[PDB]
Amino acid sequence: MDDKALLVEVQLLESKTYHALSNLPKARAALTSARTTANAIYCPPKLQATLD
Amino acid sequence: MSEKKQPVDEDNWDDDNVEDDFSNQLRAELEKHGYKMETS
Amino acid sequence: LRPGRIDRKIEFPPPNEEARLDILKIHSRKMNLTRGINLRKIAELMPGASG
Protein backbone atom coordinates (compact mmCIF):
# COMPACT_ATOMS: atom_id res chain seq x y z
CA MET A 1 0.00 0.00 0.00
CA ASP A 2 1.03 3.68 -0.45
CA ASP A 3 -0.27 4.59 3.07
CA LYS A 4 3.25 4.98 4.57
CA ALA A 5 2.00 6.81 7.69
CA LEU A 6 0.05 3.67 8.76
CA LEU A 7 3.15 1.54 7.94
CA VAL A 8 5.45 3.55 10.28
CA GLU A 9 2.94 3.22 13.15
CA VAL A 10 2.59 -0.58 12.71
CA GLN A 11 6.40 -1.00 12.48
CA LEU A 12 6.73 0.83 15.84
CA LEU A 13 4.09 -1.50 17.38
CA GLU A 14 6.17 -4.54 16.30
CA SER A 15 9.31 -3.12 18.01
CA LYS A 16 7.31 -2.54 21.23
CA THR A 17 5.95 -6.14 21.18
CA TYR A 18 9.41 -7.63 20.44
CA HIS A 19 10.79 -5.65 23.43
CA ALA A 20 7.89 -7.03 25.53
CA LEU A 21 8.84 -10.60 24.44
CA SER A 22 12.58 -9.80 25.14
CA ASN A 23 13.71 -10.30 21.49
CA LEU A 24 15.94 -7.18 21.41
CA PRO A 25 17.58 -7.60 17.93
CA LYS A 26 14.20 -7.92 16.10
CA ALA A 27 12.90 -4.94 18.15
CA ARG A 28 15.89 -2.85 16.97
CA ALA A 29 15.19 -4.00 13.38
CA ALA A 30 11.50 -2.92 13.55
CA LEU A 31 12.61 0.45 15.00
CA THR A 32 15.27 0.96 12.28
CA SER A 33 12.77 0.09 9.50
CA ALA A 34 10.18 2.45 11.02
CA ARG A 35 12.74 5.30 11.11
CA THR A 36 13.81 4.81 7.46
CA THR A 37 10.17 4.84 6.21
CA ALA A 38 9.43 7.85 8.46
CA ASN A 39 12.44 9.86 7.17
CA ALA A 40 11.05 10.10 3.59
CA ILE A 41 7.40 10.76 4.63
CA TYR A 42 6.08 13.79 6.58
CA CYS A 43 5.78 12.91 10.31
CA PRO A 44 2.90 14.23 12.50
CA PRO A 45 4.21 15.37 15.96
CA LYS A 46 2.81 12.33 17.85
CA LEU A 47 4.46 9.93 15.33
CA GLN A 48 7.87 11.68 15.55
CA ALA A 49 7.72 11.69 19.38
CA THR A 50 6.60 8.02 19.56
CA LEU A 51 9.40 7.12 17.12
CA ASP A 52 11.94 9.06 19.25
CA MET B 1 51.32 -66.04 19.15
CA SER B 2 47.68 -66.77 20.17
CA GLU B 3 47.60 -67.79 23.86
CA LYS B 4 44.64 -70.21 23.50
CA LYS B 5 45.23 -72.49 26.57
CA GLN B 6 42.37 -70.98 28.68
CA PRO B 7 39.17 -71.88 26.61
CA VAL B 8 38.97 -74.92 28.99
CA ASP B 9 38.91 -72.51 32.01
CA GLU B 10 25.78 -44.72 25.21
CA ASP B 11 24.29 -47.24 22.72
CA ASN B 12 24.17 -49.97 25.44
CA TRP B 13 27.07 -49.02 27.79
CA ASP B 14 28.95 -46.14 29.58
CA ASP B 15 25.65 -45.33 31.38
CA ASP B 16 25.75 -48.98 32.55
CA ASN B 17 27.81 -47.91 35.62
CA VAL B 18 25.39 -45.01 36.32
CA GLU B 19 22.37 -47.29 35.67
CA ASP B 20 23.84 -49.98 37.97
CA ASP B 21 24.25 -47.42 40.79
CA PHE B 22 20.48 -46.73 41.10
CA SER B 23 19.07 -49.80 39.27
CA ASN B 24 17.93 -51.13 42.68
CA GLN B 25 16.90 -47.54 43.62
CA LEU B 26 14.79 -44.93 41.72
CA ARG B 27 11.64 -46.83 42.81
CA ALA B 28 10.45 -43.37 43.95
CA GLU B 29 11.01 -42.07 40.36
CA LEU B 30 11.94 -38.68 41.96
CA GLU B 31 8.25 -37.60 42.25
CA LYS B 32 7.85 -39.75 45.41
CA HIS B 33 11.07 -38.17 46.77
CA GLY B 34 9.31 -34.79 46.46
CA TYR B 35 6.21 -36.25 48.19
CA LYS B 36 8.49 -37.53 51.00
CA MET B 37 9.79 -33.96 51.46
CA GLU B 38 6.13 -32.79 51.55
CA THR B 39 5.39 -35.29 54.38
CA SER B 40 8.60 -34.13 56.16
CA LEU C 1 47.72 2.59 -30.31
CA ARG C 2 49.47 1.79 -33.65
CA PRO C 3 48.81 -1.92 -34.45
CA GLY C 4 52.47 -2.99 -34.73
CA ARG C 5 53.21 -1.73 -31.17
CA ILE C 6 49.78 -2.92 -29.85
CA ASP C 7 48.21 -5.66 -32.07
CA ARG C 8 44.90 -6.05 -30.18
CA LYS C 9 42.60 -3.48 -28.49
CA ILE C 10 40.22 -5.74 -26.48
CA GLU C 11 37.20 -3.85 -25.02
CA PHE C 12 35.63 -4.76 -21.64
CA PRO C 13 31.89 -3.89 -21.77
CA PRO C 14 29.68 -3.13 -18.72
CA PRO C 15 28.38 -6.61 -17.72
CA ASN C 16 25.21 -7.79 -19.56
CA GLU C 17 22.25 -9.14 -17.52
CA GLU C 18 23.54 -12.72 -18.05
CA ALA C 19 27.11 -11.62 -17.16
CA ARG C 20 25.89 -9.81 -14.00
CA LEU C 21 24.22 -13.06 -12.86
CA ASP C 22 27.52 -14.92 -13.48
CA ILE C 23 29.56 -12.33 -11.47
CA LEU C 24 26.85 -12.39 -8.75
CA LYS C 25 27.17 -16.21 -8.48
CA ILE C 26 31.02 -15.97 -8.33
CA HIS C 27 30.89 -13.49 -5.41
CA SER C 28 28.00 -15.33 -3.66
CA ARG C 29 29.97 -18.63 -3.64
CA LYS C 30 30.94 -18.44 0.08
CA MET C 31 27.84 -16.54 1.27
CA ASN C 32 25.16 -18.65 3.05
CA LEU C 33 22.27 -17.62 0.73
CA THR C 34 18.89 -18.66 2.24
CA ARG C 35 16.61 -20.87 0.08
CA GLY C 36 14.20 -18.70 -1.97
CA ILE C 37 16.85 -16.09 -2.88
CA ASN C 38 16.49 -15.12 -6.57
CA LEU C 39 19.99 -14.17 -7.84
CA ARG C 40 18.55 -13.74 -11.37
CA LYS C 41 16.08 -11.06 -10.20
CA ILE C 42 18.88 -9.21 -8.33
CA ALA C 43 20.96 -9.00 -11.54
CA GLU C 44 17.88 -7.56 -13.34
CA LEU C 45 17.25 -5.05 -10.48
CA MET C 46 20.69 -3.44 -11.09
CA PRO C 47 21.03 -2.54 -14.82
CA GLY C 48 24.30 -1.21 -16.31
CA ALA C 49 26.18 -2.24 -13.13
CA SER C 50 30.01 -1.98 -13.15
CA GLY C 51 30.55 -5.63 -12.05
Binding site: L21 | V18, E29, M37, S40 | -
Partner: protein, 378 residues
Protein backbone atom coordinates in the same frame (compact mmCIF):
# COMPACT_ATOMS: atom_id res chain seq x y z
CA UNK D 1 7.42 -32.92 3.22
CA UNK D 2 6.23 -35.71 5.59
CA UNK D 3 3.98 -34.09 8.25
CA UNK D 4 2.43 -36.34 11.02
CA UNK D 5 4.74 -39.42 10.81
CA UNK D 6 6.84 -38.31 13.85
CA UNK D 7 3.69 -37.50 15.89
CA UNK D 8 2.35 -41.04 15.22
CA UNK D 9 5.65 -42.58 16.41
CA UNK D 10 5.56 -40.55 19.67
CA UNK D 11 1.95 -41.65 20.40
CA UNK D 12 2.98 -45.33 19.95
CA UNK D 13 5.92 -44.83 22.36
CA UNK D 14 3.45 -43.24 24.82
CA UNK D 15 1.37 -46.44 24.48
CA UNK D 16 3.88 -48.54 26.50
CA UNK D 17 2.57 -48.19 30.10
CA UNK D 18 -0.24 -45.50 30.05
CA UNK D 19 -2.63 -47.00 27.42
CA UNK D 20 -5.54 -46.87 29.94
CA UNK D 21 -6.97 -43.72 28.25
CA UNK D 22 -7.59 -44.86 24.64
CA UNK D 23 -8.81 -41.45 23.41
CA UNK D 24 -5.54 -39.76 24.48
CA UNK D 25 -3.34 -41.78 22.07
CA UNK D 26 -5.24 -44.73 20.45
CA UNK D 27 -8.13 -42.56 19.14
CA UNK D 28 -5.72 -40.26 17.24
CA UNK D 29 -3.73 -43.41 16.26
CA UNK D 30 -6.93 -44.90 14.74
CA UNK D 31 -7.25 -41.64 12.73
CA UNK D 32 -3.53 -42.05 11.89
CA UNK D 33 -4.22 -45.55 10.46
CA UNK D 34 -7.13 -44.20 8.32
CA UNK D 35 -4.95 -41.27 7.13
CA UNK D 36 -2.06 -41.88 4.64
CA UNK D 37 -3.33 -45.50 4.27
CA UNK D 38 -1.02 -46.69 7.12
CA UNK D 39 -1.81 -50.42 6.59
CA UNK D 40 1.40 -51.84 8.15
CA UNK D 41 1.12 -49.69 11.37
CA UNK D 42 -2.51 -50.75 12.09
CA UNK D 43 -1.35 -54.38 11.64
CA UNK D 44 1.69 -53.72 13.90
CA UNK D 45 -0.72 -52.19 16.48
CA UNK D 46 -2.92 -55.30 16.08
CA UNK D 47 0.13 -57.43 16.97
CA UNK D 48 1.15 -55.07 19.82
CA UNK D 49 -2.24 -54.93 21.63
CA UNK D 50 -5.55 -53.83 20.01
CA UNK D 51 -7.59 -56.61 18.30
CA UNK D 52 -9.05 -53.95 15.87
CA UNK D 53 -11.74 -56.50 14.72
CA UNK D 54 -14.42 -54.68 12.61
CA UNK D 55 -12.02 -51.70 12.33
CA UNK D 56 -9.68 -53.84 10.13
CA UNK D 57 -12.17 -55.11 7.50
CA UNK D 58 -12.76 -51.42 6.64
CA UNK D 59 -8.94 -51.01 6.79
CA UNK D 60 -8.68 -54.03 4.41
CA UNK D 61 -11.00 -52.01 2.11
CA UNK D 62 -8.47 -49.16 2.61
CA UNK D 63 -5.78 -51.78 1.76
CA UNK D 64 -7.66 -52.22 -1.56
CA UNK D 65 -7.40 -48.40 -1.91
CA UNK D 66 -3.65 -48.87 -1.15
CA UNK D 67 -3.73 -51.51 -3.95
CA UNK D 68 -5.36 -48.80 -6.14
CA UNK D 69 -2.37 -46.56 -5.22
CA UNK D 70 -0.10 -49.54 -6.15
CA UNK D 71 -2.06 -49.85 -9.44
CA UNK D 72 -1.51 -46.07 -9.85
CA UNK D 73 2.20 -46.75 -9.15
CA UNK D 74 2.21 -49.40 -11.92
CA UNK D 75 0.24 -47.18 -14.34
CA UNK D 76 2.48 -44.15 -13.68
CA UNK D 77 5.66 -46.29 -13.80
CA UNK D 78 4.74 -47.95 -17.14
CA UNK D 79 3.65 -44.64 -18.76
CA UNK D 80 6.84 -42.93 -17.51
CA UNK D 81 8.91 -45.97 -18.66
CA UNK D 82 7.24 -45.55 -22.10
CA UNK D 83 8.03 -41.79 -21.91
CA UNK D 84 11.46 -40.94 -23.45
CA UNK D 85 12.29 -38.44 -20.66
CA UNK D 86 14.60 -39.89 -17.96
CA UNK D 87 13.80 -39.47 -14.19
CA UNK D 88 10.06 -39.07 -14.94
CA UNK D 89 9.82 -42.76 -13.90
CA UNK D 90 11.90 -41.98 -10.78
CA UNK D 91 9.71 -38.95 -9.94
CA UNK D 92 6.60 -41.16 -10.11
CA UNK D 93 8.49 -43.94 -8.27
CA UNK D 94 9.68 -41.70 -5.39
CA UNK D 95 6.23 -40.09 -4.93
CA UNK D 96 4.52 -43.51 -4.88
CA UNK D 97 7.32 -44.87 -2.62
CA UNK D 98 6.50 -41.98 -0.23
CA UNK D 99 2.85 -43.13 -0.23
CA UNK D 100 4.19 -46.67 0.39
CA UNK D 101 6.36 -45.27 3.24
CA UNK D 102 3.15 -44.11 4.97
CA UNK D 103 1.44 -47.44 4.06
CA UNK D 104 4.25 -49.77 5.25
CA UNK D 105 7.58 -49.26 7.03
CA UNK D 106 9.37 -51.99 5.01
CA UNK D 107 7.37 -51.31 1.80
CA UNK D 108 8.26 -47.60 1.59
CA UNK D 109 11.85 -48.14 2.72
CA UNK D 110 14.66 -50.27 1.22
CA UNK D 111 14.41 -50.64 -2.59
CA UNK D 112 11.40 -48.33 -3.08
CA UNK D 113 13.43 -45.29 -1.89
CA UNK D 114 16.81 -46.84 -2.88
CA UNK D 115 15.94 -47.40 -6.58
CA UNK D 116 14.93 -43.71 -6.86
CA UNK D 117 18.18 -42.88 -4.98
CA UNK D 118 20.22 -45.07 -7.39
CA UNK D 119 19.38 -42.69 -10.27
CA UNK D 120 20.94 -39.25 -9.49
CA UNK D 121 19.94 -36.52 -12.02
CA UNK D 122 20.10 -33.95 -9.17
CA UNK D 123 22.38 -34.10 -6.08
CA UNK D 124 19.70 -32.05 -4.27
CA UNK D 125 17.03 -34.62 -5.23
CA UNK D 126 19.30 -37.42 -3.91
CA UNK D 127 19.68 -35.40 -0.66
CA UNK D 128 15.84 -35.25 -0.42
CA UNK D 129 15.73 -39.08 -0.51
CA UNK D 130 18.41 -39.26 2.24
CA UNK D 131 16.27 -36.94 4.43
CA UNK D 132 13.27 -39.22 3.75
CA UNK D 133 15.43 -42.25 4.69
CA UNK D 134 16.64 -40.53 7.91
CA UNK D 135 13.13 -39.66 9.24
CA UNK D 136 11.66 -43.20 9.02
CA UNK D 137 14.77 -44.52 10.81
CA UNK D 138 14.32 -41.84 13.51
CA UNK D 139 10.57 -42.66 13.87
CA UNK D 140 11.27 -46.41 14.34
CA UNK D 141 14.60 -45.70 16.14
CA UNK D 142 16.59 -47.69 13.52
CA UNK D 143 20.09 -46.64 14.64
CA UNK D 144 21.74 -48.41 11.66
CA UNK D 145 19.44 -46.66 9.12
CA UNK D 146 20.21 -43.32 10.84
CA UNK D 147 23.99 -43.97 10.89
CA UNK D 148 24.07 -44.83 7.16
CA UNK D 149 21.92 -41.79 6.20
CA UNK D 150 23.90 -39.28 8.31
CA UNK D 151 27.16 -40.65 6.88
CA UNK D 152 25.89 -40.36 3.28
CA UNK D 153 24.57 -36.78 3.58
CA UNK D 154 27.62 -35.43 5.47
CA UNK D 155 30.27 -37.21 3.36
CA UNK D 156 29.27 -36.00 -0.14
CA UNK D 157 25.69 -34.69 -0.54
CA UNK D 158 26.15 -31.70 1.85
CA UNK D 159 29.01 -30.58 -0.47
CA UNK D 160 27.58 -27.84 -2.74
CA UNK D 161 25.64 -24.73 -1.69
CA UNK D 162 22.57 -25.89 0.29
CA UNK D 163 22.26 -23.62 3.36
CA UNK D 164 18.58 -24.50 3.94
CA UNK D 165 19.43 -28.23 3.81
CA UNK D 166 22.45 -27.79 6.15
CA UNK D 167 20.21 -26.12 8.80
CA UNK D 168 17.53 -28.83 8.37
CA UNK D 169 20.29 -31.52 8.54
CA UNK D 170 21.71 -30.11 11.80
CA UNK D 171 18.33 -30.68 13.50
CA UNK D 172 18.36 -34.35 12.32
CA UNK D 173 21.91 -34.98 13.65
CA UNK D 174 21.05 -33.27 16.94
CA UNK D 175 17.78 -35.20 17.40
CA UNK D 176 19.70 -38.51 17.08
CA UNK D 177 22.23 -37.23 19.67
CA UNK D 178 19.24 -36.43 21.97
CA UNK D 179 17.91 -40.00 21.30
CA UNK D 180 21.32 -41.45 22.30
CA UNK D 181 22.69 -40.30 25.70
CA UNK D 182 25.24 -38.02 23.91
CA UNK D 183 23.40 -34.80 24.96
CA UNK D 184 26.51 -32.58 24.66
CA UNK D 185 26.81 -32.76 20.84
CA UNK D 186 23.06 -32.01 20.46
CA UNK D 187 23.28 -28.89 22.67
CA UNK D 188 26.12 -27.63 20.41
CA UNK D 189 24.17 -28.56 17.20
CA UNK D 190 20.95 -26.99 18.57
CA UNK D 191 22.74 -23.61 18.17
CA UNK D 192 20.52 -23.17 15.05
CA UNK D 193 17.55 -21.97 17.19
CA UNK D 194 17.43 -18.87 14.91
CA UNK D 195 16.72 -20.88 11.73
CA UNK D 196 14.93 -24.18 12.52
CA UNK D 197 12.31 -23.01 9.97
CA UNK D 198 9.23 -25.15 10.75
CA UNK D 199 10.84 -28.59 10.42
CA UNK D 200 8.23 -31.40 10.34
CA UNK D 201 10.22 -33.46 12.89
CA UNK D 202 9.83 -30.59 15.38
CA UNK D 203 6.20 -30.68 16.57
CA UNK D 204 6.68 -26.90 16.87
CA UNK D 205 9.57 -24.42 17.23
CA UNK D 206 8.27 -24.42 20.83
CA UNK D 207 9.12 -28.16 21.17
CA UNK D 208 12.58 -27.59 19.64
CA UNK D 209 13.20 -24.90 22.28
CA UNK D 210 11.99 -27.13 25.13
CA UNK D 211 14.51 -29.79 24.01
CA UNK D 212 17.31 -27.23 23.48
CA UNK D 213 16.88 -25.72 27.01
CA UNK D 214 16.61 -29.22 28.55
CA UNK D 215 19.65 -30.54 26.62
CA UNK D 216 21.85 -27.41 26.96
CA UNK D 217 21.62 -26.94 30.76
CA UNK D 218 22.92 -30.52 31.37
CA UNK D 219 25.92 -29.99 29.03
CA UNK D 220 26.47 -26.19 29.36
CA UNK D 221 28.79 -24.42 31.85
CA UNK D 222 27.47 -21.32 33.73
CA UNK D 223 29.43 -18.85 31.46
CA UNK D 224 27.83 -20.41 28.31
CA UNK D 225 24.40 -20.80 29.96
CA UNK D 226 24.13 -17.05 30.62
CA UNK D 227 25.66 -16.13 27.21
CA UNK D 228 23.60 -18.57 25.06
CA UNK D 229 20.36 -19.50 26.91
CA UNK D 230 19.78 -16.98 29.80
CA UNK D 231 20.72 -14.03 27.51
CA UNK D 232 19.44 -15.82 24.36
CA UNK D 233 17.16 -13.53 22.37
CA UNK D 234 15.08 -16.16 20.49
CA UNK D 235 14.81 -18.61 23.43
CA UNK D 236 13.45 -15.86 25.72
CA UNK D 237 10.23 -15.41 23.69
CA UNK D 238 9.66 -19.17 23.55
CA UNK D 239 10.16 -19.53 27.35
CA UNK D 240 7.65 -16.64 27.72
CA UNK D 241 5.02 -19.13 26.42
CA UNK D 242 6.02 -21.90 28.87
CA UNK D 243 6.03 -20.78 32.54
CA UNK D 244 7.50 -24.11 33.77
CA UNK D 245 10.38 -24.09 31.23
CA UNK D 246 11.12 -20.45 32.13
CA UNK D 247 11.14 -21.14 35.90
CA UNK D 248 13.32 -24.28 35.54
CA UNK D 249 15.84 -22.59 33.18
CA UNK D 250 15.90 -19.39 35.30
CA UNK D 251 16.09 -21.15 38.71
CA UNK D 252 19.44 -22.86 38.10
CA UNK D 253 21.02 -19.52 36.98
CA UNK D 254 19.12 -17.59 39.73
CA UNK D 255 20.39 -20.22 42.23
CA UNK D 256 16.74 -20.81 43.26
CA UNK D 257 17.47 -24.40 44.43
CA UNK D 258 14.07 -24.99 46.09
CA UNK D 259 12.04 -24.05 42.97
CA UNK D 260 14.24 -26.00 40.53
CA UNK D 261 14.04 -29.26 42.52
CA UNK D 262 10.21 -29.10 42.33
CA UNK D 263 10.46 -28.04 38.65
CA UNK D 264 12.88 -30.93 37.87
CA UNK D 265 10.20 -33.38 39.10
CA UNK D 266 7.73 -31.84 36.58
CA UNK D 267 10.47 -32.25 33.91
CA UNK D 268 10.97 -35.94 34.88
CA UNK D 269 7.33 -36.84 34.13
CA UNK D 270 7.58 -35.00 30.77
CA UNK D 271 10.95 -36.67 29.93
CA UNK D 272 9.64 -40.22 30.66
CA UNK D 273 6.44 -39.58 28.63
CA UNK D 274 8.41 -38.01 25.73
CA UNK D 275 9.61 -40.43 23.02
CA UNK D 276 13.40 -40.11 22.32
CA UNK D 277 13.89 -38.57 25.81
CA UNK D 278 12.59 -41.53 27.91
CA UNK D 279 15.72 -43.81 27.53
CA UNK D 280 17.98 -41.32 29.39
CA UNK D 281 15.33 -39.98 31.79
CA UNK D 282 17.25 -41.33 34.83
CA UNK D 283 20.63 -40.00 33.61
CA UNK D 284 19.18 -36.52 32.98
CA UNK D 285 17.60 -36.16 36.45
CA UNK D 286 20.61 -37.46 38.45
CA UNK D 287 23.14 -35.50 36.32
CA UNK D 288 21.08 -32.34 36.98
CA UNK D 289 21.03 -33.19 40.72
CA UNK D 290 24.86 -33.60 40.65
CA UNK D 291 25.23 -30.24 38.82
CA UNK D 292 22.84 -28.58 41.33
CA UNK D 293 24.78 -30.02 44.32
CA UNK D 294 28.12 -28.85 42.84
CA UNK D 295 26.85 -25.26 42.32
CA UNK D 296 25.90 -24.38 45.94
CA UNK D 297 28.90 -26.33 47.36
CA UNK D 298 31.38 -24.41 45.13
CA UNK D 299 30.69 -21.12 47.01
CA UNK D 300 31.15 -22.36 50.62
CA UNK D 301 33.96 -24.60 51.96
CA UNK D 302 31.82 -25.33 55.06
CA UNK D 303 28.08 -26.02 54.66
CA UNK D 304 25.75 -27.24 57.42
CA UNK D 305 23.39 -29.95 56.04
CA UNK D 306 20.60 -27.94 57.69
CA UNK D 307 21.47 -25.04 55.34
CA UNK D 308 21.31 -27.42 52.32
CA UNK D 309 17.87 -28.58 53.51
CA UNK D 310 16.66 -24.96 53.66
CA UNK D 311 17.97 -24.33 50.11
CA UNK D 312 16.43 -27.57 48.72
CA UNK D 313 13.85 -30.03 50.16
CA UNK D 314 13.17 -29.79 53.94
CA UNK D 315 14.24 -33.34 54.94
CA UNK D 316 17.93 -33.40 56.05
CA UNK D 317 18.24 -37.19 55.61
CA UNK D 318 17.23 -37.13 51.90
CA UNK D 319 19.88 -34.51 51.02
CA UNK D 320 22.38 -36.55 53.13
CA UNK D 321 21.71 -39.86 51.30
CA UNK D 322 22.04 -38.20 47.84
CA UNK D 323 25.15 -36.44 49.11
CA UNK D 324 26.74 -39.75 50.20
CA UNK D 325 25.88 -41.59 46.94
CA UNK D 326 27.06 -38.71 44.71
CA UNK D 327 30.24 -38.31 46.85
CA UNK D 328 30.82 -42.08 46.41
CA UNK D 329 30.44 -41.72 42.61
CA UNK D 330 33.29 -39.16 42.73
CA UNK D 331 30.69 -36.52 41.86
CA UNK D 332 30.09 -33.59 44.31
CA UNK D 333 33.93 -33.33 44.87
CA UNK D 334 33.55 -32.91 48.70
CA UNK D 335 33.95 -34.84 52.00
CA UNK D 336 30.82 -35.19 54.23
CA UNK D 337 30.94 -35.21 58.08
CA UNK D 338 28.54 -36.58 60.75
CA UNK D 339 27.60 -35.25 64.29
CA UNK D 340 29.36 -31.98 63.26
CA UNK D 341 26.88 -32.09 60.31
CA UNK D 342 29.16 -29.85 58.15
CA UNK D 343 30.08 -30.69 54.49
CA UNK D 344 33.69 -29.64 53.61
CA UNK D 345 35.45 -29.08 50.23
CA UNK D 346 37.90 -30.99 47.96
CA UNK D 347 41.32 -29.89 46.59
CA UNK D 348 41.46 -27.57 43.53
CA UNK D 349 42.91 -28.96 40.24
CA UNK D 350 45.31 -25.97 39.87
CA UNK D 351 46.44 -26.10 43.51
CA UNK D 352 47.74 -29.73 43.65
CA UNK D 353 45.64 -31.82 41.22
CA UNK D 354 47.96 -30.37 38.53
CA UNK D 355 50.44 -33.06 39.71
CA UNK D 356 47.58 -35.61 39.47
CA UNK D 357 46.63 -34.25 36.01
CA UNK D 358 50.22 -34.73 34.76
CA UNK D 359 50.34 -38.26 36.29
CA UNK D 360 46.93 -39.34 34.82
CA UNK D 361 47.99 -38.31 31.28
CA UNK D 362 51.48 -39.67 32.05
CA UNK D 363 50.38 -43.18 33.10
CA UNK D 364 48.68 -43.87 29.71
CA UNK D 365 51.46 -41.92 27.92
CA UNK D 366 54.25 -43.91 29.68
CA UNK D 367 52.36 -47.22 29.32
CA UNK D 368 52.36 -46.80 25.53
CA UNK D 369 56.18 -46.46 25.36
CA UNK D 370 56.74 -49.62 27.48
CA UNK D 371 54.70 -51.77 25.04
CA UNK D 372 56.12 -49.98 21.95
CA UNK D 373 59.81 -50.43 22.79
CA UNK D 374 59.41 -54.23 23.11
CA UNK D 375 58.00 -54.57 19.55
CA UNK D 376 61.14 -53.04 17.90
CA UNK D 377 63.47 -54.31 20.69
CA UNK D 378 62.20 -57.92 20.14
Amino acid sequence: PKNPDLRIAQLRFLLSLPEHRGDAAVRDELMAAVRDNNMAPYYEALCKSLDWQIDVDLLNKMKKANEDELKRLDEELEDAEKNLGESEIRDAMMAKAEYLCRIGDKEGALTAFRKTYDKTVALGHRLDIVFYLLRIGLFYMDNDLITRNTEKAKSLIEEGGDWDRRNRLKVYQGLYCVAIRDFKQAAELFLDTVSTFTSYELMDYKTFVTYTVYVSMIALERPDLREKVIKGAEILEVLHSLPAVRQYLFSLYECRYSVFFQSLAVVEQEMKKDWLFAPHYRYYVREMRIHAYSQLLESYRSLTLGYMAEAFGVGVEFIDQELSRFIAAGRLHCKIDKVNEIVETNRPDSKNWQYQETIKKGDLLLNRVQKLSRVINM
